[model samples]
Target chain A: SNELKVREFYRLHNACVKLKESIKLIYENPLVTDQNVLNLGTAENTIDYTILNTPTLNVAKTLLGNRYSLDLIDLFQSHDFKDSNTDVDMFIKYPVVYDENLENLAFMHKAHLNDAQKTQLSNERLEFLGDSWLGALVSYIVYTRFPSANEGMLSQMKESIVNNNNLFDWSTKLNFTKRLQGNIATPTRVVKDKMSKRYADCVQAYIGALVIDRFGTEFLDIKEWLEELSEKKLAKSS
Target chain B: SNELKVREFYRLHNACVKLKESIKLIYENPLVTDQNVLNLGTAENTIDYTILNTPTLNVAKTLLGNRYSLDLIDLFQSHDFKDSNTDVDMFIKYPVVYDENLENLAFMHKSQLSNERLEFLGDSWLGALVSYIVYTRFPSANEGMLSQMKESIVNNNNLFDWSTKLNFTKRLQGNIAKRYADCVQAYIGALVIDRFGTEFLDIKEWLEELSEKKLAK
Candidate 1:
C-alpha cells in the first residue's frame, strides 16, 4: 500500500507535467480559428505557469479545475529539449510569468480587447524584471569570460548580443512567436512579425522567472551558455 | 612554506581571538560617533571612480584560474578602523559613495559603475547557488515548502551570522555593525567569482562545506 501510495504521487506529478505540456502547445501551435477552439488554447495558460492547478491536474480526466479537453493527450505527448538535453528552466525564477495572464492589453493589438478586458494582463512588470536580469547576467558573464577586455569592450559585447535584431533571430529560431496566445484579429504574417519582437521578451521573462524562482542548475548553465555565446561574438569581431 | 602559503591565501582573513577582543573593547569604548566616520553602504553606488590603489594589495595575486581584484584592493584597507572593530568591508558591494564626480556636471552621483554592477552580478550569483542547493537536496519538498525554507535560509540574519563565522568582517572596515553584516552576501558574491573563475565547481564546493558546517545546524 505504501509503495502504491508512492506510485500515485509520481503519477500525480506526471499528470501535472502532461497538463503543462499540452496547454503550452496550444499557444505554441495554433489550432484556434473560432471562439470555441480559442478557449481551448488561450483559456488555459502555459508559457506563464509551470504547474497548472495541481489538484485539478490530478483529476484532469473529468471536469477538472481547468481541464478543457482530451484533445492534447495525443497532441504534445513527446517531451521537451529540457527533459533530455538542457537543464535551463526560466519559469521558476519569474513566478509571476508562471502565472502569466494569458490576455493583456500591453502586447494585444487594438483588435483583441473590448473596454472591460482592456485592463486585464500586462507583461510590463515581467518585462522589467526580465530586462534587468538579462542586463545583469549578460554583463557578468562577459566581464569574467574575457578578463582582459576593458569596459568599452564589455558594454559593446553585451549590447550586441541581446540587441533587438539578434533577439528577433533567436525568437524565430525558437518559434516563441507561435506560442503567444492572444485574441488579435491581425493577419498571421503581421501578428507573427510584431510577435517576433515580443516573444523575445517572454523568453527573457522566462529566463528572469527562473532566477526569480531560483532554479540552480538551470541558472548555472544559462550563465555558461551566455559566456560561450559571447566568446563567439568576440571572436567574430576581432 | 606551507604555513606561509596558507596564510597568504587567507591574507586578509583575521586577527587572533585576543586581537579581535582588544579591538572590540577599544571599539566599544571609543569613537562611536564623529560624524566624520559614517557608513554609506551597498544600498547605492557612489558616482565616481578612484584608484584608491595601494602597493600592498597589488601583490596582484592570482590562482591558477582566478582573476585579480580590479583595483578595489586597498580603498578598503584601514589601520584606521581596525584601530576600532566594527569590521565592515567598504568596497566589496557598494563602493564608497563618491561625492567626487559630478562628471563635469552630468549625473550628480553615479560613477564607479562597477560597484553597482558587481552587486548586480552577486545578486544573480547568490540566487542561483542557494536555489540549486535547495533544489537538489530537497527532492521530496514540493514547490511551496522548498521556496519557504529557501526564503528563511537565505534571510539577511543568516547571512550576517555566516559572515561573522566565516571571518568576513576583517576585510570589511566599517563603523556600523549593521552595514558590515548587510554586505555579507555581497562579499560571498564577490568571493565566489574571485575564487572560482567563470566555472561553477569552486563555489559549489564551498556551498557543500557551508551546508555541512554552518547551514546544517
Candidate 2:
C-alpha cells in the first residue's frame, strides 16, 4: 500500500505531469514535431521545475526564518501567469505583504516594476531602498574580510562580482534557471539563455516579496543569506 | 654627490639628453596647452601609456624569450602626437609600427598604434575581462571583495607596483606626472591587455598591490 501510494504521488507530481504533457504536446503539435522537438526534449527533460521550485522556495524561507510567512506555495504560484492584461503580466505576479508603512511595504515591489512605471506606481522609491539594502549587505561582507582595501578598490571589486552577468552566471550554475516556468520551445539551449532575465527578475522580486512577507524583522536573515551566498559563490569560482 | 652624478650622467647620455630636450620642447610648445594637447595629456595620464608600453615589452620578451630588439625608450616615445591638427593627431602620430617587410612585429607595438591610443582602445575589453576574472575567481567573495579586487587591479595601485617592480620609475626619462606612481597602475592595466592575451592577465598582481599599498606591508 505504501509503495502504491508512493507511486501515485510520483505520478501526480507537477514535474512528472508537466514532463508527460510536454512530450505529448510536442508529438501532437505539428509546429514542434516538424521542428524536431524530440531532440530539444532531451534538454527540456533535465529540469524538473516543480522539484526545483520547492527547494528554492524552501531555501528562501529557511533563509528568511520567522520574519516572513514562509509560503513556498505562495511563491511558486506567484509566478503563474493569470488572465489579467496588466503590464505586470509581462513579469511574475505575487502578493507582497509589508509590515511597515505602505511606502516601506511598497518599496520591494517597486524594484520589480520598470523604470517608467516605478514613478507612476512609486516603485522606484522601493527599488532605491532595495538597491541600497543589497548594496549595504554586499558592502558589509567586503568591509569585514577586506579590511585593508580602500573604498574605491572595494567598489570596483563589488561591481565586478555582483553585476548582472556574473549573477546570471551564478544563478544558472546553481540551476536556479531549472526552476523557472516558461513556454517550452527547443530545450537544448541552457536555462540561462531561455530564462535569464526572468530568473534575475524573480530573484529581485522574491527579495521584495520576502521584505513584504517578513516586514523588516527578518531582514537581517536575508542579508546574512546573501552574504553567505556571495561568499560561497566566490569560493566555488575561485 | 649622487644627485650631481645622476645629473651629469643624464648630460653625458645622448638618448637622455635628446629625451630631455624633446620633453622641454613638448612641454613648452604653445600648441601643447591647447585642449587637444591637454586631452592627449589627460589620455596619457588616464591610460599611463609609457609604463604600460615599456614593461609589457619586457614581459612579452620574457614570455616569448626571443631575440626581439625591443627598445623600451623608442617604444615608449613612439606614441608622440603625430599630426599637428585635429583630434586624430594622436592616432596619426602613433601609427602602428610595421617591420621592414611591412609585416607586424609581434612585440614592436601593440596591435594598435600608440600606447596611449591603445590604452583608450583597450579600456572596455580590459573592463569585461577583469570583471569576468573577478566574478569567476571569488565565487564566494562578496560584492565588496569583488569590487575591491576589480578596483585594485584596474586602478592605480597595481600599475604603480608593476612600475616599481620593473624599476620604470627610476629609469623614467620624461616629464613624469605629478602622481606618476599612481599612473603606473593604469599603464599596467593597458599592458596586461595589450601584450599578454587578456585571458593571461593576472588578478594576483591586483591582490598583491592591495596587500602592499593598502595593507602597508
Candidate 3:
C-alpha cells in the first residue's frame, strides 16, 4: 500500500534530518571535533552528552537503506510489509540464566520514563558496554577471517556487518524485538518510525545483560556466540 | 627554548586548521552527513577516508592543551622542553613471547608497508577487553576510577612506555611516539585475532600488575 511507502519514507526523512543535525552540530562546534572526535579513544568522560548518546543504530540504518537507495524503496513498494511475523531464536543459546531484575533493566527503554524521573533505569549504559563488546568481537572475527587483509581492507570488512541496520535486521530475525518491554505504549507512529533503532538497541542491551549475568565468566561464551552470528552475517553480506 | 614554543604552537595551529576544515566539509557536504555520520559504527566502509582518519589523537591533544590554554603556553615558555624521556614499562608483564614476525607486524606503522589496520583492530579490542578487565578486577571501584584507570592503562603514554621498554623504540619503522604506542596495540590485535582469548590471561595478568602498581601508588 502507498501507506507503507509513506511510512518508510517518513523513517528515511527522520534519519536524514537527524543526520544533517549531527553534521551541523559538528560543523558549528570546534569543541566537538577537538574533544569528541579526538579524544574518541579516552574522552568518554568529556564527550558532550549529545554526541555520546548519538543513536548510532539509527545512523547506520539510514545509510544502509540509502545504499541500495532505489532498491530499498522499491522493495518496500512491492512487498506486503508484515510488521512482526518471523521470530528467530535469541537468548536461546545464551550461556547463563540472567536475573529477572537485570533482564528488566536490559529491556527498559528510555522512552518508558518521564522527563523528571531522576533515577530511571534504561538499557543505555548496557548498550554502551555491549557496543564495545560487539566491536571487539566483530574486529576479532574480521581480523581472523581475513588474515591477509590490510588495516584499511580489514576496516572495510568490519564496517560491512557491524552497522545498526545489520543489528536491527538480526535482532528482528532473532525475535529480540518482541522481548523489549518499555515503550510499548509510546505513540505507535513514534515506535514504528524508530523500529530499526529500537530493535538494534535491544540486541546491544541483551549483550550487555549477558555480560553482567556472569561477569567475566560468560565472555568466551559471548565471543563464541557472536563469532558464529557475525560469521554467518559476514558470509551472506559478501 | 622559544623554538619549543614555536613547535608546540605550530602543532596547535595545525590542529585548528584541520578542525576548521572538518567543520567546513561537514557543513557543505550533504552526502557526507547522510552516509558518514549516520553509520558511524558500521560506516567504516563508506566513511570518507578523510573523516575515518580524523587523527583523533591530535584532536584530543589540541583540546587538552587549549583547556588549560594560557597555562600550557606559559609553562612551555618557562620550562625546558624534553621529548620522549620519561619511559614507562610495557609488555614487561606480558605473558606470551610473541613471534618475531608478529612483533614486526605490530610495530610496523602505516608509514611502513602497513600496520595501521592492526592498530584499528587493537584499539577497539583493547578498549573492550581492558574495560572488562578493569570492571571485574575492582568490583568495589567507583565509575570514575573504572573509566580513569582503563584510560590510564591503554593510553598513548602507557603503551609507548611498554613499547619503549620492549626495545620497540629501536625496531619501529615509524618515528612518532603515537605510532610507537599504536604498534603495541597492533601487536595486541595480532595476538587476540590469531590466538583468540587464550592470550587474554597474559594481557589480564600484565594489566593486573600494572593497574595495581599504578592504582596503589
Top candidate on TM-score is 3
**Model 2 lDDT at residue B151:** 59
Clashing pairs in 3: A59-B38, A151-B117, B90-B162
TM-score of each: 0.31, 0.22, 0.43
User: Candidate 1 or 2, higher lDDT?
Assistant: 1
lDDT of 1 by residue, B1-217 (tens): 3222222212112211112222222222211212312121211222101101211111111110121321111212212223112222221232121122211111111243333334434555555454444434443443344456555555667556655654556654468764433354344335434333212222223223322322222
Ranking by DockQ: 3, 1, 2
Candidate 1: CAPRI quality band: incorrect
- C-alpha RMSD over true interface residues, model 1: 27.9
For model 1, what TM-score is found for chain B?
0.36
lDDT of 1 by residue, A1-52 (tens): 2222222222222223322332342222211222221222323333112112
Question: Whose TM-score is higher: candidate 2's or candidate 3's?
Answer: 3
* Residue-level lDDT tens digits of model 2 in A60-178: 22222322432222332343411112222122223222222332323222228654444434333333223333333344334434755554656666566546665466456435554
Q: Score the docking of each candidate (DockQ).
A: 0.02, 0.01, 0.06
lDDT of 3 by residue, B29-89 (tens): 3333334333432533423222233322122223233434323223322433222111111
